[PDB]
């Protein structure tokens, strides 16, 4: 019944399916197979090299399958045909798909999403453009080949005895059409040779996702032991609904999913609000509606006061919009295909959404609610095509006495002035001219660099984009008068647009801006970006300060989704709160110069009036304002992007003359022929006569933009501030037209999203309708467009920032991708990467996902990540050595490595991954391992992994390779401005001082600081990192052949360091019967392994324990502008270990200033270090990421209440030592709660026998003193802790 044996058998059968005839053994930690490749052999043969048997090494291997190389068997990867053993199911979805195929004659090249275009055996010029489009927009990426996923689906279907529809259509396709394409393992983005249709990889990805969701819903259903899901009092089947969705969305996947994702969310938001009895969970916090101190009592049912209101016209139109939206999508899907099916269950359920009650305390409804929001996860990353369009000024709304545009501009200008004053109040000010040449590195994270720079390295020329290299090369030219007085509105100067994908929606466009525009923007906008980062403000409408109103930046500060968003649960639990959410459409489009830009410019202009006495190299501030924003600089600018092309015949190009055939500078796609201008394109373009495509090349189709840009340095602040103005106008108008009906209690502004918590003083339908009409009338006259179909106005349901709450309980939606990925990634560090995915899977399972399927997915992924990526090394007689010889007789062979799945459950430091089989939130560590093996209950769980330890080879990791083999030829010309006067002082000397600059500072020394900074900048660039990756194979060979099968479990540590193994010095007792009363919690959709933890231990109701000494060091280091991105606390402590702690404040100030730390941070760090050295122990605690995941953030652990309740420890211990105890205590108590053990208090015990006390004293003394290193650093033993340890335990 243990998961460790079932998963082992599962993955074993998957491995034997993937590689037939495998010699895989469960009891061995690794396996090695050979693979043969002929691609290098051919290219060697064309140089006339002589080889032995050519295709024989193919034919003899594929057929007989018994040839051996140095005794190690050689196998070939299994064919596409036999992945599902040739079974068929004649599924209707297959004919639905093949009916949706389209010939090339119906091409619309400007399509956002590609349709199901057929692939012909012969070639044509338009098919080249189709191939070019498909290669880019149809990439899967990810980290695991799709065939491995298909094998896993087949095996798990065999295990669970159920047949997903996705596997059915998969088998139906492969039974006749054989391979879809070819994918390489060394680089998964090499998809090539499309066989049948250009949209096949989308089919495979969607079918695997659908099968994963079908498995997950069935296993989660079995966990709760329910027979069917429930809607009201009616039974419903989830797999039926999922198949019903899947069959309909298949004609045109991306478009249908994008147009259909909204009604499903609206139904979930609107479910159960109008029921006569309502079940709510009590929650109580502070007076403010954004208090974060909630606590939960119990459930109750209450009558609904709002029941009579739901006969309103507004709700009827809201429902009717969604019925039209579902029906038009169904009609389009039926028309494109050859089917007459529809969505009967969903339209049946939509008919009575209001009156059917919602039951948060019944899992049959909560699972359904969570599943409907997670359905949309089958069309990830939504790559799309975008077109360049100008500003079209004619449709802009002119200000007239019937609108509110001038009022919006005036109020937003007043808000800029007020916010600037508020930022000045918080000692945040604009940059000073003394800081002009050093603050340019402080650009916001949404910024982008316009011009890429060229670097010579020693030999090779390369290009780079990141701010550091471009600035360090050409920063002095940024402010020069030549670059200031130029405008980007002609052919000679222009800027290009980029694009980045998003997980579900269409690809988002971004703007690249030259640094000469960004820096003047930064000069003014830096203090406001700094100031608005703070949290915890008051959001009452009658409060003067506007700092707390903006929620931008007030997200993920705690780090837990459930913890920081508790106001949603609190407001949804309150019957007296009415919540309103306005959803705008094309917000960034409607920020015009009539309403937004001019008032903002005026706010900045009369903002800098008190600073008019300052000058910047002759220029004054109001000239810098025009430098940052102005015509030809930000507004009224030309922009380049995707080309525009038109449909013509072939021979029309032949009748053209050479004036229309002149090819310009701009590049054109593969399958399109050039043409001079767009005018001749309009003359020649013919619609019915599709034979060829032509694209203009003279630059007449660039975009003219006079609208707010997403790449600017103040986009979020401006957007939220504009929304503040809009909300002020909305409140003013609703107060004026309908006095006293609606009172605003809280207003919330983040991005384009707006939220209101208000009190409604009436239940009459006609008053509510007039109020809603007034709101929509006001927002319409204001210039924007507000959709009445998405705008939400509800008593009991609250949504913000993709977070949903219904009746005081958390309804999670899961959008975490598992198969695909946003961009291609290369795994520099396998172990940290697997750590990252297991951390993300913790979040996924915390969002309602099944725990066992998560374990199975990690069990799969832990085996195949390291495979296929080692090369130019061969193994013979258990010895690794370089690839054969110069004989070139076995040159075509490579070695592939397969890891034991159970390596997922062996701790870090033992070459493994720190996951725990009992629950994923517990981190394996050596002490945790020995504790688990000493527990008698876990033996059956721990039995297989007992024999798998001490067999794991070292993991692939290119990150620790650090050498000097990347000498650059380009130099740091701007160094004369980057170096602090501390650095600038020690380079004017005639090398006399050079010989006395012998402090142990390492690479940060005068005469070498510039080179080391440049070197680090290159190592930030991956295209520069790729040069040193060649030599890492030899070091990996050294790591392999230096490995010895031995487990060390060194519970000691480096004497400067302390870890959680320290608690293993003492024995641990469990006594006392604690209270068994269960606690309440809002998230009622968890796995039982997590549910037991959330019930035994309540939610966190306080701040976590005080930050560590390293945390304080990092916070102090977060004050230096130029070194925050270059200095961590580890870098400081590494220098300190050689420098020593026995120094005065002046010594440390001088040392830090020499290390490019500015003198104020130097003084602060020196004083704090002196205080810590004099007062406390000062040892840094190393933790294995424990208590750092998503779920542990929400538990009542690692807090002072937790220590006071659950822990009793001797008083002789120090604060760092008791913290090291406390983390182990949290881990142990979490593990005991997970196993269902009785709740008992835990104590650390020290016995009366003398010999144990002698060893404890010896160990503590050797731990607190770094032995012979006391000579190196001359640390005075007169520090309080070490001097006090003389007779602590005597």
């Amino acid at each position: 019944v243990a998961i460790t044996v079932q998963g082992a058998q599962l993955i074993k059968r998957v491995v034997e399916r993937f590689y037939p005839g495998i010699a895989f053994n469960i009891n061995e930690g690794a396996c090695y197979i050979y693979k043969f490749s002929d691609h290098i052999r051919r290219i060697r043969m064309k140089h006339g090299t002589k080889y032995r048997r050519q295709a024989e090494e193919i034919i003899r291997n594929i057929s007989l399958r018994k040839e051996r190389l140095y005794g190690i068997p050689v196998l070939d990867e299994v064919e596409w045909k036999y992945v599902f053993d040739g079974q068929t199911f004649q599924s209707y979805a297959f004919e639905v798909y093949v009916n949706s195929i389209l010939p090339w004659s119906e091409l619309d090249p400007e399509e956002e999403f590609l349709r199901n275009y057929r692939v012909s055996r012969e070639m044509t010029e338009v098919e080249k453009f189709i191939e070019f489009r498909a290669k880019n927009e149809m990439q899967i990426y990810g980290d695991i080949p799709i065939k491995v996923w298909c094998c896993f689906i087949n095996e798990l279907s065999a295990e669970l005895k159920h047949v997903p529809l996705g596997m059915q259509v998969m088998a139906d396709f492969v039974n006749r059409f054989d391979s879809p394409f070819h994918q390489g393992n060394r680089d998964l983005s090499n998809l090539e040779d499309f066989q049948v249709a250009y949209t096949t990889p989308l089919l495979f990805e969607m079918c695997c996702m659908e099968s994963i969701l079908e498995f997950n819903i069935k296993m989660r259903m079995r966990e709760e032991e329910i027979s069917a899901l429930e809607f009201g009092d009616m039974k419903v089947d989830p797999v039926g609904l999922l198949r019903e969705f899947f069959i309909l969305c298949l004609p045109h996947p991306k478009k249908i999913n994008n147009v259909l994702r909204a009604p499903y969310s609206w139904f979930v938001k609107m479910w159960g609000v109008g029921a006569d009895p309502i079940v709510v969970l009590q929650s109580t916090a502070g007076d403010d509606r954004n208090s974060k101190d909630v606590f939960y009592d119990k459930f109750r049912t209450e009558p609904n006061r709002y029941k009579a209101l739901f006969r309103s016209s507004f709700y009827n139109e809201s429902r009717r919009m969604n019925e039209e939206k579902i029906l038009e999508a169904v009609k389009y899907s039926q028309k494109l295909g050859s089917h007459d099916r529809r969505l009967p269950l969903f339209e049946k359920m939509l008919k009575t959404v209001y009156t059917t009650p919602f039951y948060p305390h019944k899992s049959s409804n909560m699972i359904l609610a969570s599943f409907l929001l997670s359905i949309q996860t089958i069309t990830g990353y939504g790559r799309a095509w975008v077109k360049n369009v100008s500003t079209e000024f004619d449709k802009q709304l002119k200000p007239n006495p019937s609108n509110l545009v001038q009022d919006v501009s005036d109020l937003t200008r007043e808000f800029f002035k007020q916010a600037y004053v508020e930022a000045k109040e918080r000692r945040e000010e604009i940059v000073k001219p003394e800081d002009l040449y050093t603050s340019m590195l402080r650009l916001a994270r949404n910024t982008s660099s316009g011009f890429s720079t060229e670097i010579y390295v020693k030999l090779i020329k390369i290009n780079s984009r990141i701010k550091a290299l471009v600035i360090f090369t050409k920063g002095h030219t940024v402010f020069t008068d030549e670059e200031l007085h130029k405008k980007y509105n002609s052919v000679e100067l222009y800027q290009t647009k980029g694009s980045r994908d998003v997980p579900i929606k269409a690809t988002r466009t971004i703007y690249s801006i030259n640094l000469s525009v960004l820096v003047p923007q930064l000069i003014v906008t830096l203090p406001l970006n700094e100031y608005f980062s703070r949290v915890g403000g008051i959001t009452s409408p009658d409060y003067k300060k506007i700092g707390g109103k903006v929620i931008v930046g007030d997200l993920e500060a705690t780090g837990s989704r459930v913890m920081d968003a508790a106001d949603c649960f609190r407001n949804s639990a309150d019957r007296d709160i009415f919540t309103i959410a306005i959803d705008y459409s094309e917000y960034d489009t409607h920020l015009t110069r009539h309403n937004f830009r001019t008032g903002m410019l005026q706010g900045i202009r009369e903002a800098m009036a008190p600073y008019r006495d300052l000058r910047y190299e002759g220029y004054t501030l109001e000239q810098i304002i025009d430098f940052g924003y102005g015509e030809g600089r930000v507004a009224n600018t030309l922009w380049n992007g995707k080309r525009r092309l038109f449909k013509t015949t072939f021979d029309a190009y032949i009748r053209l003359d050479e004036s229309e055939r002149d090819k310009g500078s701009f590049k054109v796609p593969k399958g399109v022929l050039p043409v001079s201008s767009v005018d001749v394109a309009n003359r020649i373009a013919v619609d019915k006569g599709f034979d060829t495509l032509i694209a203009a090349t003279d630059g007449s189709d660039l975009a003219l933009i006079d609208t707010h840009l997403s790449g600017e340095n103040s986009t979020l602040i401006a957007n939220s501030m504009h929304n503040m103005a809009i909300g002020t106008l909305m409140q003013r108008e609703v107060g004026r037209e309908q006095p006293g009906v609606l009172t605003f209690l809280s207003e919330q502004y983040v991005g384009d999203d707006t939220l209101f918590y208000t009190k409604l003083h009436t239940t009459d339908t006609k008053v509510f309708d007039k109020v809603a009409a007034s709101i929509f009338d006001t927002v319409a006259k204001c210039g924007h467009e507000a959709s009445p179909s998405k705008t939400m106005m509800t008593p009991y349901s609250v949504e913000k920032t993709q977070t949903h709450a219904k009746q005081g309980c958390y309804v999670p939606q899961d959008r975490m991708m598992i198969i695909s990925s946003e961009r291609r990634k290369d795994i520099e560090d396998v172990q940290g990467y697997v750590r990252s995915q297991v951390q993300t899977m913790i979040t996924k399972v915390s969002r309602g996902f099944c725990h066992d399927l998560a374990q199975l997915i990690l069990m799969l992924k832990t085996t195949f990540i390291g495979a296929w990526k080692m090369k130019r090394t061969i193994k013979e007689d258990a010895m690794y050595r370089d690839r054969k010889f110069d004989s070139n007789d076995e040159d075509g062979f490579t070695l592939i490595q397969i890891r034991n799945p159970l390596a997922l459950y062996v701790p870090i430091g033992w070459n493994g991954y720190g996951a725990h089989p009992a629950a994923l939130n517990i981190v394996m560590t050596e002490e945790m391992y020995v504790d688990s093996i000493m527990i008698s209950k876990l033996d059956e769980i721990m039995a297989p992994i007992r024999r798998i330890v001490h067999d794991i080879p070292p993991c692939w990791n290119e990150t620790q390779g650090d050498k000097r083999g990347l000498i650059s030829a380009t130099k740091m010309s701007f160094f004369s401005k980057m170096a602090r006067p501390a650095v600038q002082a020690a380079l004017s000397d005639p090398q006399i001082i050079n010989l006395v600059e012998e402090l142990p500072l390492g690479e940060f020394s005068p005469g070498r600081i510039s080179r080391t900074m440049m070197h680090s900048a290159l190592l930030k660039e991956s295209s520069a990192r790729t040069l040193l990756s060649s030599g890492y194979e030899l070091e990996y060979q050294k790591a392999l052949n230096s490995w010895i099968t031995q487990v060390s479990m060194r519970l000691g540590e480096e004497s400067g360091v302390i870890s959680t193994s320290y608690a293993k010095l003492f024995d641990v007792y469990f006594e006392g019967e604690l209270d068994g009363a269960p606690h309440m919690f809002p998230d009622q959709n968890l796995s039982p392994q997590f549910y037991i933890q959330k019930m035994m231990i309540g939610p966190r109701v306080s701040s976590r324990v005080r930050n560590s000494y390293v945390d304080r060091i990092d916070v102090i280091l977060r004050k230096d502008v130029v070194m925050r991105g270059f200095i961590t606390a580890n870098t400081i402590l590494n220098v300190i270990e050689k420098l020593g702690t026995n120094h005065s404040v002046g010594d440390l100030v001088t040392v830090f200033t020499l290390m490019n730390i500015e003198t104020r941070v130097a003084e602060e760090l020196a004083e704090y270090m002196t205080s810590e050295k004099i007062r406390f122990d000062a040892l840094k605690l190393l933790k294995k990421g424990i208590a750092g995941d998503e779920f542990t953030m929400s538990l009542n652990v690692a807090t002072q209440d937790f220590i006071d309740t659950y822990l009793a420890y001797p008083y002789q211990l120090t604060k760092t030592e008791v913290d090291a105890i406390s983390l182990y205590c949290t881990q142990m108590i979490m593990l005991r709660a997970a196993l269902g053990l009785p709740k008992k208090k835990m104590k650390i015990v020290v016995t009366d026998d003398a010999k144990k006390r002698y060893k404890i004293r010896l160990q503590r003394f050797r731990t607190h003193v770094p032995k012979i290193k006391v000579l190196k650093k001359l640390i005075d033993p007169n520090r309080m802790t070490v001097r006090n340890l003389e007779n602590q335990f005597v």
Partner: protein, 350 residues
């Protein structure tokens, strides 16, 4: 008065269905209607705000100056509140905002009852935080007796040859003389007839001012002798103000050798003055309605409570924890959003 200022006012006939000077007697003639009026007043006139902690350097320079030593105050300075404790603080402030109708009591849960440090700190704080004088009371008798026992336990738990103690004949708590000057502790035992041990000791708590919007309740409440008529600026209002009980508590603390705690309270005094100035402003300006208790019924609550008479409304009793007193002493109530029903209340009343 915008409706009366148009240019057609010279030939307009006005009709009114209601009158503003509503008789407050007709509201209180409903039999057994005290709790309903209290609930209506709370729902109508109570504002909302937040709680502000003082500057943490005060405790750093006055309470934890000596690292090598540890006491009860040093232990409880580093603690942090929870949600339920904040709710208890809210209950304490709600009881404070109504002088006589709401009273407090202590929970019987063990744990905190066996902890000495919390009991001592609460015993010290509650004598300055609450009022049990000769006009109105905020506490039950059991809570006062428990606080007296806690202060007795704190005042002599660790005494040496420098601090001479002379016991009394009765053997009751606080019946001893302490210090070199023989300070008498008998004044700090609770006595509801005269209120020696609390904020009502030798001060004027209530007055009467003749012109009031409502004639049934024209009392004027002033905690610790603050005549808060003007607007409050927290940085300047309480620079040089003091009252009798605080001075006597400081004298006892310095007499018994508790110098650090005396310094802490001396530094914390202006904040303690400002909180009560705000509370008196809130009581005297925001909670004035016909639902407020009449003067004739207000002056008889304490005699009925001390005499065991139940011919009128029994005041509501609430329960709070021990550490909630210490957490309340370090929090001040600053109103940030006044109630929405202030300007609509008289019409509803009529």
């Amino acid at each position: 008065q915008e409706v009366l200022t148009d240019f057609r006012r010279q030939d307009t006939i006005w009709v009114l269905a209601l009158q503003l000077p509503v008789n407050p007697q007709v509201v209180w003639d409903v039999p057994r209607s005290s709790i309903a009026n209290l609930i209506m007043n709370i729902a109508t006139c109570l504002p909302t705000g937040e709680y502000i902690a003082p500057n943490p350097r005060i405790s750093s320079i006055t309470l934890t100056q000596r690292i090598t030593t540890t006491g009860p105050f040093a232990i409880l300075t580093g603690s942090t509140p929870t949600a339920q404790q904040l709710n208890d603080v809210r209950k304490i402030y709600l009881a404070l905002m109504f002088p006589g109708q709401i009273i407090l009591d202590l929970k019987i849960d063990p744990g905190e009852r066996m902890d000495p440090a919390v009991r001592m700190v609460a015993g010290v704080v509650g004598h300055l935080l609450f009022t049990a004088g000769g006009r109105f009371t905020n506490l039950t008798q059991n809570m006062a007796r428990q606080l007296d026992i806690a202060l007795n336990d704190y005042l002599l738990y660790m005494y040496n040859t420098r601090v001479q103690v002379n016991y009394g004949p009765t053997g009751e708590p606080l019946d001893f003389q302490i210090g070199r000057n023989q300070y008498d502790c008998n004044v700090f035992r609770a006595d509801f007839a005269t209120g020696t041990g609390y904020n009502g000791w030798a001060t004027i708590d209530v007055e009467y001012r003749e012109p009031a919007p409502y004639v049934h309740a024209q009392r004027y409440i002033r905690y610790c002798g603050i005549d808060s008529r003007e607007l409050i600026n927290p940085t300047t209002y309480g620079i040089g103000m003091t009252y009798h009980c605080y001075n006597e508590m400081l004298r006892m603390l310095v007499a018994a050798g508790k110098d650090s705690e005396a310094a802490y309270f001396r530094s914390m005094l202006p904040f303690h003055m400002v909180r009560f100035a705000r509370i008196n402003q809130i009581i005297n300006e925001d909670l004035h309605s016909v639902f407020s208790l009449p003067d004739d019924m207000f002056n008889a609550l304490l005699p009925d409570l001390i005499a065991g008479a139940h011919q009128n409304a029994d005041p509501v009793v609430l329960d709070v924890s021990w550490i909630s007193l210490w957490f309340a002493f370090n929090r001040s109530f600053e109103p940030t959003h006044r109630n929405e029903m202030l300007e609509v209340a008289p019409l509803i009343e009529s």
